[PDB]
Ligand binder design. Structure first.
Ligand SMILES: [Ca+2]
Length: 316
């Protein structure tokens, strides 16, 4: 054990997707990340949140996270925390930094759709005419795969789609207006904002990164998966690999540009962007499923570890 990742303030990992900190009630959402960071001296706490309504609604994920943050502080005697969120967890983290600015030292978002997801938009369009979504082979595939990851549910296939409602372009637009952030860039610029923000007289360090495995091609039509080789085992041992190429292809046909299967490069930009060139799909970002990634995908565990050291070096 060493102190490479020993930050001053505790680290809270904030999940996204359908709910809780587990996939199918048994697999850790942040696969293998907590034990790694702890072996490097970090104090890590993993949030467990629920709900499909907006992050700022009554008893919504935002309020749940805020309550959790206060329990962590009260138990540790620490005065602030470092928030690291994935997918919707980046939106959740934003709520806490906005309503209790004095309790947050930094906000890092990984593959967060700050400006919405074109796939979430597509699903909303289809259910307007096929309340089932199944007339779409892409939706069927998405549901089949992501339905198996839902924890604590009696209708996992339904819940798999429910998790996309808050990620639409329209919903995030509303959220961004009610919860502005210096970390966001100007509208329609596909540029990031400021590296820091001063809120309630508290300074926050702002960071982000995302994956761009899915690239547009002139010829799955119109898209290619750059995370995998020719004959890649990740295409077999991880069912989310081809599922996210399919959803990413839909995104590209909806003018998203390069993406991770659910979040475009432009939508992910927030604060200081470490990189968006990682050859990752949305689940590779969190070492899923079960540590499986394509031959061209970088090590996500190493990437996160290096970032917690980065925080330490910044004094948080
Ligand atoms: Ca994977």
């Amino acid at each position: 054990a060493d102190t490479y990742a020993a930050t001053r303030y505790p680290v809270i990992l904030v999940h996204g997707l359908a709910g809780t900190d587990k996939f199918a009630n048994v697999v850790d959402y942040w696969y293998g990340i907590q034990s790694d960071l702890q072996s490097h001296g970090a104090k890590v706490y993993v949030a467990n949140l629920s709900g499909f309504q907006s992050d700022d609604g009554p008893n919504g994920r935002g309020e749940q996270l805020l309550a959790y943050v206060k329990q962590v502080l009260a138990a540790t005697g620490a005065t602030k925390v470092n928030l690291i969120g994935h997918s919707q967890g980046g939106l959740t983290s934003r709520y806490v930094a906005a309503v209790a600015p004095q309790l947050v030292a930094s906000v890092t978002t990984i593959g967060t759709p700050h400006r919405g997801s074109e796939f979430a938009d597509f699903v909303q369009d289809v259910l307007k005419t096929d309340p089932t979504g199944l007339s779409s082979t892409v939706i069927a595939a998405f549901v089949n795969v992501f339905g198996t990851l839902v924890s604590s549910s009696h209708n996992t296939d339904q819940d798999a789609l429910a998790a996309l409602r808050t990620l639409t372009t329209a919903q995030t637009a509303t959220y961004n207006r009610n919860f502005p952030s210096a970390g966001l860039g100007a509208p329609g610029s596909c540029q990031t904002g400021a590296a820091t923000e001063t809120v309630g007289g508290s300074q926050h360090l702002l960071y982000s990164w995302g994956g761009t495995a899915i690239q547009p091609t002139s010829t799955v039509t119109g898209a290619t998966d750059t995370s995998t080789g020719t004959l890649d085992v990740a295409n077999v041992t991880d069912p989310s690999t081809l599922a996210l190429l399919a959803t990413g292809a839909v995104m590209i046909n909806r003018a998203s540009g390069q993406n991770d299967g659910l979040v475009s490069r432009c939508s992910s930009l927030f604060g200081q962007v470490i990189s968006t060139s990682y050859h990752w799909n949305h689940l590779d970002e969190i070492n899923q499923l079960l540590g499986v990634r394509g031959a061209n995908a970088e090590d996500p565990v190493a990437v996160i570890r290096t970032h917690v050291n980065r925080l330490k070096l910044q004094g948080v």
